[PDB]
Amino acid sequence: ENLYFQGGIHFNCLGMGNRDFIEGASGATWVDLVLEGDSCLTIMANDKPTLDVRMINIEASQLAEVRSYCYHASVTDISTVARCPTTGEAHNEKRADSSYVCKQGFTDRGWGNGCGFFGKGSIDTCAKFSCTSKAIGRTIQPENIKYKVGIFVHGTTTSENHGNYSAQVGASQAAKFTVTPNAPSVALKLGDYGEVTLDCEPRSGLNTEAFYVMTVGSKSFLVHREWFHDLALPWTSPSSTAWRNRELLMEFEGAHATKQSVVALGSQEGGLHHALAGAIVVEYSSSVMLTSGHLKCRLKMDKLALKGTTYGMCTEKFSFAKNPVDTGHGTVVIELSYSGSDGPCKIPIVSVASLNDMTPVGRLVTVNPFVATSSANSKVLVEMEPPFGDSYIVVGRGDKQINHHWHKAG
């Protein structure tokens, strides 16, 4: 696919409002995760590159109609047949046309309006019903659900490309894969970092017998099933193609002598949206429905390796392309510019408590940061967790070395 000319996706964590950090046991082969749809996980493990994993969305396909409800009807071609008192029931011939809704009644008759006898004359009034606009309720089967999950390895990035999916796939540093009930475990390679396996239990986060997907006009919703069954609207189903309870959208008004008007209610769409005010909204424009939720998984990392743990250290001078800023997640991010051209090469960077005391404090989130190109003045983003209080970010070695002060409150 041409990702370079497709829309971006949220596939990693920096900049997102909701972010959780996960620390995997040192040496452990697996880490247990719950992907929540509005959030993002950063996974850090000793001797492992750092990962972002996040659910992108949940898709359902091939949904089956259960019932359709008319919410806006047209009512046309009204007629009334009437009879005199004592002559029995009126029968309008449109009773033979399944498209018509008919109702019997009575009107006052006498000499004055054409009857030899005084009393109640039978009338029968029919009108053609058609559905102008209908809402549709559908079921999802679990086999037709797909979870799209993004993964990102904290390799070399820049402030410009860090969140760009086509750039990180280009760098072999991101990927997007699909777990389903029938295929709930997936292995993918991550460039020079080996592979991971996502071993998930999709069925545990599914409740497809609890709801219907209901489309109303331009919106679709997840609705409680019994609420859907008791809607007071005309309906059809696959096993019952003709509209039943069509009178619900019709008003047979007061009859006089031999005439009676029948009108349609206005659209019931707005009433429906009102009733659905607090219901889950889902995207259901195409044949595919998109929603969000939870997915429990185990992330396997025994085949996940460090990359370039054998490059040489960068030898030339760095500078701060962007001075450190708090990410809002308890971490600090910088962007470095590297003047050298021996790249790719490892960035010497540490937090120390003072320049007297060059003892490493804190730690990197972008573990093993590296310049990835021989181009001079390239950029590398580095995310880190300094300690509380005063420390200095120290980049490079010797007298090439630069530092920036930082203070973390608390």
Numbering used by the authors: -9 to 400
What does the paper say about this structure?
To address this open question we determined the X-ray structures of the E protein ectodomains of JEV SA14-14-2 and of its parent virulent SA14 virus in a monomeric state and reliably modeled dimers (assembled to 180-mers) and trimers mostly present during the viral life cycle. The structures of JEV SA14 and SA14-14-2 E protein are highly similar to those of other flaviviruses. Architecturally, all of them consist of three domains, Domain I (DI, yellow), Domain II (DII, red) and Domain III (DIII, dark blue).
The JEV SA14-14-2 in our study is used for the JE live attenuated vaccine production in China. The overall crystal structures of JEV SA14 and SA14-14-2 E proteins were determined at a resolution of 2.2 Å and 2.1 Å, respectively, by molecular replacement methods. The rotation angle between JEV SA14 and SA14-14-2 DII relative to the superimposed DIII was 12.5° resulting in a distance between the two Gly102 (b and c) of 21.9 Å. Notably, JEV SA14-14-2 Met279 superimposes with JEV SA14 Val280 which implicates a shortcut of segment 280–283 and a prolongation of the preceding β hairpin 274–279. Met279 contacts Ala50, Ile130, Val203, Val272 and Tyr274 and thus becomes part of a hydrophobic patch which is larger than that in JEV SA14 E protein ectodomain. While Glu138Lys change is the key event to shift Glu49 to Lys138 in JEV SA14-14-2 E protein and thus induce the inversion of the side chain direction of residue 279 from the bulk solvent to the hydrophobic protein interior accompanied by a rotation of the preceding β hairpin 274–279 towards DIII which pulls the entire DII with it. Although the fusion loops of the determined JEV SA14 and SA14-14-2 E protein are structurally similar, the Leu107Phe change slightly modifies the surface profile and the hydrophobicity. We speculated the aromatic side chain of Phe107 in JE attenuated virus SA14-14-2 E protein might cause some steric hindrance, such that the invasion of Trp101 of JE attenuated virus SA14-14-2 E protein into the membrane is hampered compared to JE virulent virus SA14 thereby causing virulence attenuation. The lower fusion activity of JE attenuated virus SA14-14-2 is compatible with its unfavorable trimer geometry and its reduced dimer dissociation capability because of the fixation of the DII to DI + DIII angle in JEV SA14-14-2 monomers due to the mutation of residues 107, 138 and 279.
